[model samples]
Target: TWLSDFPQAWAETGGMGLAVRQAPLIIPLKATSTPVSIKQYPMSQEARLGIKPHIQRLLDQGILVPCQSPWNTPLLPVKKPGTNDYRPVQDLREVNKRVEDIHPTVPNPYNLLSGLPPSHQWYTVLDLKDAFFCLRLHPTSQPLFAFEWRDPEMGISGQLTWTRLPQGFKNSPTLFDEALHRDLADFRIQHPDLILLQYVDDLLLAATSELDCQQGTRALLQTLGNLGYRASAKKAQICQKQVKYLGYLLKEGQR
Candidate 1:
């Protein structure tokens, strides 16, 4: 979880209990692991000089992903000096086609927020950090991702390099939800006493007593952390009489 505790620290943490599901680890990648054949591109001259380590670290951690956005495509007409700027630019009309539409089950956050009214006596909210990043792309496709930096004109402008693409694109939430569904299926974890709901990584689990709520919190934290994903503790709310989840409030017996 995002609690910053070591894996062994769960046992010593008070007011929580853990339930670990014994299952093989699984990661669903959008791109294949096999390296795709692409034309060789020159690296930015400044990159070799170590201008920015943060960008380099992003590459190292596979956070950056390749995109076919028009931003990377070159414009036409060149906009040459003393020339008509009528050159046709690269059309980004196809971008919307690649994006996935994410439709929430309730769609209305206020409706979900109303759920808190009736169940507000005790509540718990779990927010997972970088949920989509937990799933990684196949190592083979690592070279297919190429990105131009923020200030492309700074040094060796227009140079491109490959890195892992992010999973947070428009279609990412649906993919993440589907993957999460399958992951939960692998572990037979369902508590009837708790009313559970989720909007991507923001999870809400409600129970009658603080003990049950905390137990549920501990169980979920342990399970998700064991899977190598971090949960947001700073935003996590446990055992509150009335708590908000995804902009929806849950109040004791007031739903």
Candidate 2:
């Protein structure tokens, strides 16, 4: 498999050592907005302990950095439905209120699929691992995402901020979609024979033959790698006659 051939593209558990872009993200906030700080919501001792590993792993990845800011928020422990795993959620309602919503530029699923030619048989799907973290957050805007955390057993209590585009940000999807679109704009023009569809971080490529599909997949992977985007090995389906894309089974040009 292509994943075994390119091990660096896969992120280990906890998103450790994944490739990150150097470009700083530009977030538009409302003019003349006052800083808002919200207190953390209460949680059980078990909940706090359960979320410690998740927070620590992000810190170790350098995605989160220690910081003190006037704009602060509390972290909430979110239990994954149907699973024992817990995810840390930052209560950023006050912050989000001050953020200006960028008009969404995401392509409609129907429109994206409509562009594919009926003759195309081979297909490939690429999922960007930790998509939001690939874009670096500007230093000036980093404090806007600062949240407090404490580990009782370790005696560590402090505030940390996201240094990259963090999930749950109001305009993250739009901004990331635009950035990725721009990055692949030339590829779309250059490969008229191949159909490429991008929905945020998920990319789908289709071609008329297995050889064309493989070549296009390789080129797309190389572009993503050079641009510092990591492809998820577990989610990749490359150069197959039939594959799933955007929750639909794509076979013989019918989704």
Candidate 3:
């Protein structure tokens, strides 16, 4: 298996299991006289209990930490569409409204792949697992993400904050995309032979032949591993003639 070749690049079941980057993310809150704290939305006992394990797992992983702050929000428990499992979601609408919006740096899909040459036949797609979790949140800005939670059985009730970037933040995508772009800038310049397209955490590497594609994939995986990025084995497509990238299929050099 391709994944077996790179055991360190795969994350544990629920997390990326990688160290947070030293470069902390600073979220500038909108200048307001008062802090915002939205009341918690009511939920069933079962629903609340269902999400405890998920929350505990994150806490155990050091992704979340105990916090007390003027800014607060509700913890929303959303069930998976086809399963009984529940995911802890932060209702960040209030927070989003108060945070300054950053200009999006996400690349356009059409423009990203339109420049690829017909000679680039073989391709590789790499998806970063828990991409936002790889970035550390600035200690000063962590309180902006504090949310209330209670576990009846565990006798726990209080606010917890994300030490790393959370998924629900309006600016998370842009921040992460910009950070990753900086990390990969030199690699991109050094390997002009391989067409590398990045949309947030999804990486697509295109080459003219199978050998070149494989070599590029190896180098990319090494770079990601060195930078503490974990790639999703289940979602990765390497050294293939046809592969889906950024919602389009590339087969025989045609989308």
Candidate 4:
């Protein structure tokens, strides 16, 4: 796996965090604010098995490269089998010494989705494939994230081991957002007709007209892919009326 070849990809690429083990096959409940309904179609299965092939094709076309995760936060552990509670793995407040100050404009997914204007139209939502897992981390900083996981051997009483980094860590989103903001600034691909917004890897892009939207969408996807990130076609689409972005309703017509 490219990840194995570049173990520190998480840190080096754009300071993305990496999980020692694969992110849980199932998107754990605690990650989101609302209880994700089981009725909500499983996004990962399509992501891994379905979109992965498409992503591989994109890679073959030199459209994407696996970059490090664009985050600096540590991964948190899910609740143990018997316990109903778990602690946040890392606190950005403590790590904030080096991190940048976040602006209030960053949309709160829950609030944004709730207050969307009624007249707004619908749009498509796309998730980057193994977005963060693509980047490598700095070798020196790797030791900072040493957590223990179960040994598959003795069933319950497995031995302990430490890892460099883990995915799905609590503070990762903010870190990733900040890094991406910086990268976009550096890339300087300014197009007036399109509006592109992101909450971590979930991206929402809209164009004023269908032709503009399609062009913007293709350009944005190509840009990110060229930077070593995978964008899946099956996971991406054009929709109408209402679409979700950063957990917001994102009425289609407005930016």
Candidate 5:
């Protein structure tokens, strides 16, 4: 029922989210940092097949674009869980080393879970799909994530860069956490009765009763959608007396 009120918040319908209130992220590099370009490694047939479709989808969605830059990183193919499929993940180690560090606002998991008490039993958990992509990466910083792509049959070959926050960046967690906080600041004020705990992309809304949790879930999804955030509807748990969040099974506010 809550999903009906916020169809756009579903990853299937909304696709990728773009933070409307948050400014584009400008990656800062250390003063001593210089351009580093790494060549693409040879890929296995299986890995290449697995990654091709995903790359095409990202390009079609405008998340990835063709570019040439002094900064280049190898894209490592990682297998999906319980499947032979592979996804291209950038090896950002070198790039991460060159970037200037920022304060981490990401809260400790143990500390955050402590906020959930026995008084609030009802809970709803939703993990935002591709949460990092919601935040835009500034044009100047896009060059830092370029990866070489060459497709022979398609006659396409170039260095592709990300337009939004790319995965594998060392500071992405803190950046994404801070951005979501600003976007959800008013939400916390609007629903003081609801206890919403945010850990980067994963969200847990705790309430004392089912009715409150239901109403709160509706409001939460609507606010998230309006703020350009999409949560996978298929994985959402609405008004549950017990639920799994962040690998912990919670019941009666106790894990």
Candidate 6:
């Protein structure tokens, strides 16, 4: 029901979310940071097979583009859960070391749960789909994340970097959290009655009644869709008295 109600907010219909309202992220490098290139290591046939399709998907989506950069990183293949299909996982540790640090804005679950008052019995939980992918990376900083990739079938291989913020970066959660907060600033001001709590990509909306939660959820979905954010419809719990959030089961205003 909720999926159809908010098609643009769900990943199934929404595709990849892009936060067009915000400026592209420009990663600041440490004063001592310098460009470094690390060549990829030999991989098993299985690993090579796994990364082939994964890289193509990103390239097709325009998330990854061919580039020649001074910086280079390796990519590892990871098998999908309960499946033989494989995915490419970029190793970003070397790149992370060079980037300037940002304040950690993601609070602990204990601190986030404290905002839930006894009066707020109804809840809506939404997990943003590809949360970090929504944020674009500035062109100048894009080369800093370049990784080597090969396509044995196409007889082509080159360096490709993410146009959007790549996962596995140490500061991605903090950056994404802060960006979402800024984009949602207006929604928070307009809906003072809704208790909207954000912990990185996970969000919870608490309300005093089922009606309030239903109304608030629709408004939130609309706002999120308009701002180029997508939620996983399969994981969304709409106006439910009992819902799981932040690894805890919430019900009757209790965790």
Ranking by TM-score: 6, 5, 3, 2, 1, 4
Query: Which residue pairs of candidate 6 clash?
Result: none
* C-alpha TM-score for every candidate: 0.58, 0.91, 0.93, 0.49, 0.96, 0.96
Question: What lDDT score goes with residue 172 in model 6?
Answer: 94
Residue-wise C-alpha lDDT for candidate 6, range 1-255, written one tens digit per residue = 877888789899888899989899999999999998999987788888867877778889899999999999888878867758888888899999999898888889999999878888889999999999899999999999998877656744588899999998999999999999999999999988889999989999998888999899999999999899999998988898999999999977777
Backbone clash numbers for all candidates listed: 20, 0, 0, 32, 0, 0
Clashing pairs in 2: none
lDDT of each: 0.48, 0.80, 0.82, 0.42, 0.89, 0.89
Alpha-carbon runs more than 4 Å astray in model 4: 1-106, 110-122, 149-165, 168-170, 186-188, 239-241, 248-255
Candidate 4's residue-wise lDDT over 55-127, tens digit each?
3453353323333322233324334546444332332332234323444444566644444343324354667
Query: Candidates 1 and 3: which is better by lDDT?
Result: 3
Candidates 2 and 4, the one with greater lDDT:
2
Q: lDDT score, residue 22, model 2? A: 43
Ranking according to lDDT, highest score first: 6, 5, 3, 2, 1, 4
Runs of candidate 1 exceeding 4 Å displacement: 1-54, 65-96, 99-120, 139-145, 150-168, 186-190, 253-255
Of the two candidates 3 and 5, the one with more favorable TM-score, higher being better, is 5
Against the true structure, candidate 1 reaches a TM-score of 0.58
Q: What is candidate 5's TM-score against the reference?
A: 0.96
Clashes of 2: 0
Cα-based RMSD of the predictions, in order? 10.2, 2.3, 2.0, 13.7, 1.4, 1.4
Error of 2 at 83 (Å): 6.9
The candidate, 1 or 5, that scores higher on TM-score is 5
Distance (Å) between predicted and true CA of 2, model 4?
Answer: 24
- Per-residue lDDT over 1-255 for candidate 2, one digit per residue giving the tens place of the 0 to 100 score: 676655555553223332343468867788878788887677788788778888788888788988898888888878877646778888778888998777888888888899888888888888888888888888999999998877666644577899988888877887788888877788888888998888998888888889999888888877777667777877788888888887888877786
